[PDB]
């Protein structure tokens, strides 16, 4: 970890993302589906969502705050309903929407280095609103 060589805002979502992805890896390695929605299908859907979130293109580095935003969007379950093959489109669209409209949010995240409760509430509003308005 580099003795806390990761920004606090990134840590907050990264810990849960790591745990969820570990659990998803442990359970979704069969491809021989039988029937446990609450336990497995819930977990593996979130794992697929987080993997699509992790997928990234070439020669397009993302700023740490934008990564925090997208990883937040995926890890809070807001994208669980989103289609697994449409997650990437949502990632790109949400990134653009945040950068353009809510650039102040990104600035605050970067300046503070930590997502406070108030910043979390702002992120909740942003993601929920865009997610509802994502598909016209």
């Amino acid at each position: 970890v580099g003795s806390a060589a990761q920004t606090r805002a990134m840590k907050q979502v990264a810990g849960t993302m790591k745990l969820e992805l570990a659990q998803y890896r442990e359970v979704a390695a069969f491809a021989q589906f039988g029937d446990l929605d609450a336990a497995t299908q819930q977990l593996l859907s979130r794992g697929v969502r987080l993997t699509e979130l992790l997928k990234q293109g070439q020669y397009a580095p993302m700023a740490i705050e934008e990564q925090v935003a997208v990883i937040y969007a995926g890890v809070r379950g807001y994208l669980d309903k989103l289609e697994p093959s449409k997650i990437t489109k949502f990632e790109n669209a949400f990134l653009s929407h945040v950068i353009s409209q809510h650039q102040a949010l990104l600035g605050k995240i970067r300046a503070d280095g930590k997502i406070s409760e108030e910043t979390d509430a702002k992120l909740k509003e942003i993601v929920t609103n865009f997610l509802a308005g994502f598909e016209a």
């Binding site: 442990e26 359970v27 979704a28 390695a29 069969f30 021989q32 446990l36 609450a38 336990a39 497995t40």
Partner: protein, 53 residues
Amino acid sequence: DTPEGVRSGAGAVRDAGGAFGKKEQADEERYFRARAREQLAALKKHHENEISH
């Protein structure tokens, strides 16, 4: 038989790390993940019962 011939041991399927090993790993998890939920719910019911009494 002849000792020279390669001899397999317990756990080789999982030790290989192939598709069959991964299937065994996931299958064990899927079963006990569900079992833990039943056990946890039963424990919650036990706790509620002792709270009532």
